[PDB]
Amino acid sequence: QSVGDSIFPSLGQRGLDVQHYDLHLTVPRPGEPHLSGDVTLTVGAREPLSRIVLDLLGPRVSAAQWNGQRVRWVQTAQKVEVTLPRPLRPGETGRLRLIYAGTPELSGDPGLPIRPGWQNEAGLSYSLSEPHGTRGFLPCNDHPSDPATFTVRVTVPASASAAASGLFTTQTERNGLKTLTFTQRVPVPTYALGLIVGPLERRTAPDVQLGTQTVHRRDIYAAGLPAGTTVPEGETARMLRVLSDWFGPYPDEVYGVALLPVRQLALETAGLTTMPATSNRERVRLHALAHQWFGDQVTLADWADTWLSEGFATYAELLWAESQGEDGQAMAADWYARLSVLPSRPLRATREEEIFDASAYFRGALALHALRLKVGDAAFGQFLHSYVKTFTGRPVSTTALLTLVKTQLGAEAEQTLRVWVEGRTLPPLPEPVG
Numbered sequence: 001q002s003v004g005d006s007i008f009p010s011l012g013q014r015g016l017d018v019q020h021y022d023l024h025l026t027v028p029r030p031g032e033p034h035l036s037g038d039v040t041l042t043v044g045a046r047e048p049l050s051r052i053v054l055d056l057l058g059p060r061v062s063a064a065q066w067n068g069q070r071v072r073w074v075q076t077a078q079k080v081e082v083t084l085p086r087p088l089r090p091g092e093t094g095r096l097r098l099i100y101a102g103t104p105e106l107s108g109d110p111g112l113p114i115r116p117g118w119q120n121e122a123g124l125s126y127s128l129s130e131p132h133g134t135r136g137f138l139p140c141n142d143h144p145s146d147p148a149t150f151t152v153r154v155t156v157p158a159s160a161s162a163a164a165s166g167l168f169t170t171q172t173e174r175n176g177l178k179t180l181t182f183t184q185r186v187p188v189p190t191y192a193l194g195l196i197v198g199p200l201e202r203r204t205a206p207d208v209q210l211g212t213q214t215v216h217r218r219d220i221y222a223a224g225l226p227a228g229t230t231v232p233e234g235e236t237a238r239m240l241r242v243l244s245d246w247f248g249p250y251p252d253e254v255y256g257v258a259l260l261p262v263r264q265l266a267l268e269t270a271g272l273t274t275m276p277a278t279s280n281r282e283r284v285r286l287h288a289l290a291h292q293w294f295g296d297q298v299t300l301a302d303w304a305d306t307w308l309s310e311g312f313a314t315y316a317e318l319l320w321a322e323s324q325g326e327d328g329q330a331m332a333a334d335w336y337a338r339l340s341v342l343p344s345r346p347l348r349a350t351r352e353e354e355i356f357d358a359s360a361y362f363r364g365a366l367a368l369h370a371l372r373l374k375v376g377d378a379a380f381g382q383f384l385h386s387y388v389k390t391f392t393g394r395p396v397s398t399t400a401l402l403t404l405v406k407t408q409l410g411a412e413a414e415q416t417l418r419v420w421v422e423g424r425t426l427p428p429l430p431e432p433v434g
């Protein structure tokens with residue numbers, strides 16, 4: 001019934017394909033968790049579905065409609081189950097509308113770097129929901145194997161502002177309330193949906209030209225940032241050029257950061273990275289930008305394969321470092337020096353405590369380092385382009401990665417990657433052949 005994730009076995013609905021979220025969120029007091037919601041989901045199906053089963057954790061549904069007609073629905077524990085008048089079959093789409101209100105609940109589970117979900121602190125409310133927190137404020141197929149496009153209308157007090165993933169179009173104001181509209185036009189996972197409300201300011205930068213492609217530039221600056229919380233001029237353009245030369249075209253229409261005066265890890269929310277100031281370093285800004293490809297465009301089929309996101313985002317830091325004239329092998333050796341004193345594991349995680357551990361970041365990066373040094377920078381760069389293309393529109397798996405390596409690069413290259421994928425012991429540091 002559910003997606004059947006190996007880490008979170010109850011999330012999502014098997015065969016459900018949400019294609020667009022049309023969300024109208026109203027945040028009456030930024031900084032406090034209460035909110036109300038009005039969302040219409042455009043859903044398709046990969047198998048016949050008698051019901052639409054959505055994740056929701058906290059708020060209470062008050063009304064539901066299907067294609068504009070009243071429909072039978074029930075809220076059970078962590079799910080909203082909607083019985084359709086007839087099954088939704090592959091090739092068809094329907095519009096499920098849900099009216100809800102209440103307090104999002106955090107899924108803060110010990111073994112995760114955050115309590116994921118709707119965050120509320122210091123006059124700000126914002127989404128920081130990787131892996132399974134979006135269900136706190138949005139009835140959603142809350143699994144990265146079902147990315148979707150988003151249109152978000154955020155209604156906030158006039159004194160406040162709001163920013164969400166997607167290009168900002170309109171802002172209207174009545175009765176002391178402002179409503180802002182953002183359109184995320186390339187599909188991204190539920191947790192990749194950026195949404196921040198509170199005292200914040202929008203700052204545009206000149207367009208970035210990546211050959212034919214134009215990438216808009218916009219950052220968010222919340223009030224009360226520490227001194228020296230900046231995006232160095234020109235850095236994001238150089239990062240976009242260097243990363244897109246490695247991975248292929250940038251997947252989105254805009255990139256920037258939302259700098260927050262809070263103490264938290266950064267999250268690669270689509271086109272607008274949620275960037276607490278304590279994480280605002282060059283290497284994190286690169287990391288989060290790399291994730292726009294590996295995580296937001298190329299999405300995970302199963303939360304056990306987090307290293308496909310975190311390892312690839314981590315290896316981009318070394319590609320960026322080399323691009324800036326630094327020694328890549330020395331950085332790889334630093335990754336290894338930090339893993340040599342830590343427990344190691346195969347790259348496929350089996351427990352939630354492992355999905356964001358040192359192996360997912362650095363053992364995955366060193367896995368890519370072993371592959372790159374085996375096939376050469378030319379072959380490696382052509383494989384990263386192929387990888388992004390092969391898994392655009394299709395969730396990626398560790399198995400699918402190895403098969404693509406054998407396919408494209410050969411059996412020897414596949415076996416080089418596999419020793420890093422499999423095996424509990426940490427392999428020796430990948431070093432140039434010579």
Ligand code: MET
Nearest residue numbers: 113114130265266267287
């Ligand atoms: C605390 S969850 C954030 C994960 C994100 N991919 C990172 O680089 O830290």
Ligand code: NA
Nearest residue numbers: 017018146147
């Ligand atoms: Na989808």
Ligand SMILES: [Zn+2]
Nearest residue numbers: 287291310313
């Ligand atoms: Zn990351």
